[model samples]
Target: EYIKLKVIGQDSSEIHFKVKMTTHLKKLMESYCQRQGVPMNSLRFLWEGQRIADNHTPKELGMEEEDVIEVYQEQTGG
Candidate 1:
């Protein structure tokens, strides 16, 4: 399934991307979420304490070669 990443503290939008379950990213996200008591599927990417997607082309977002993106998952509560 395509995962959707919503950037927080920025705007209301989503980035969708595809990856295999066996990929390193997926494994790490799963492990990270597990430690946080969150499911792997609930994990996401964060940038500057905001979530971002890895699907966007660097040029699409005006990213430079030296630019680094920081992203995390959305942690929700009841």
Candidate 2:
């Protein structure tokens, strides 16, 4: 089964995906960062106001169709 995901960037940029329920969130995050030409380590993903772990899947987290996830750039100390 596949669930549609809405990935929102801090700048309001957005990407949509038809992701597999069993796929790890890390896989999606990595692919999105790669396609956007951004460093994977520079961003983090959040769902339902909680940080998402790489090991968790959408189904495992009880995500529904068209769920929205936020991607924020990691803050630097510099």
Candidate 3:
């Protein structure tokens, strides 16, 4: 099965992806970063305000069609 997911970026840009429910989020994240020219591991994938791991799937995270996933830059060493 496939679901429509929205990814939002820091500039409030939206990118939509249709992916399988069982697909690893890592794949989706990689594709997003690639398109944005962002370096891997340089950003945070957020689902419902919590940090999401690469191992999680849309199904595993209880995501629904058209749900939004926010992408924010990773910050360290403040």
Candidate 4:
């Protein structure tokens, strides 16, 4: 399958990346997320701005390609 990603870089421009799904790719993503202290719940894959997940495997809800699969920590400030 084809996956697309749009990112707002340091330059503030939306950079796009398209990729083909691979087996190792998903493992790498999950591993990276763990290293970044990002929880799985806040992370998701976005297709056309809509979130998608792999229910047959592990899944989540706001992400894009090149997102590093980081954890999305919820704010708890008063």
Residue 59 Cα positional deviation in candidate 4, in Å, after optimal superposition: 17
> What are the runs in model 4 whose C-alpha is more than 4 Å off?
1-29, 55-78
Each model's number of backbone clashes?
8, 0, 0, 2
What does candidate 4's lDDT look like per residue over 1-78, in tens digits?
A: 445544331212243445345423455334434554655564554344443344322223333455532222334687
User: lDDT of candidate 1 vs native?
Assistant: 0.40
What ranking of all candidate models by lDDT puts the best one first? 2, 3, 4, 1
lDDT for each residue of candidate 3 in 1-78, tens digit (9 for 90 to 100): 689999997854578999899988898888888888788788798988977788888888789989989988967795
TM-score of each: 0.34, 0.87, 0.89, 0.33
lDDT (Cα, tens digit) per residue for candidate 2, span 5-55? 999987646989888989988888888888788887888898878888889
Give the 10-residue window scoring lowest on summed lDDT in candidate 2: 9-18
Q: Rank the candidates by TM-score, best first.
A: 3, 2, 1, 4
Give candidate 2 regions above 4 Å deviation: none
Deviation in angstroms for 77 in model 3? 4.4
Stretches of candidate 3 exceeding 4 Å from the true structure:
none
Q: How many Å off is the CA of 47 in candidate 3?
A: 0.9
Q: What do the candidate models score in CA lDDT, each in turn?
A: 0.40, 0.86, 0.85, 0.41
lDDT of 3 at 47: 82
Model 3: residue 13 alpha-carbon error in angstroms: 3.7
**Residues 27-52, candidate 1, lDDT per residue (tens digit)?**
43344444456555565655444343
The predictions' CA RMSDs to the true structure, in order, are 10.5, 1.6, 1.5, 7.3
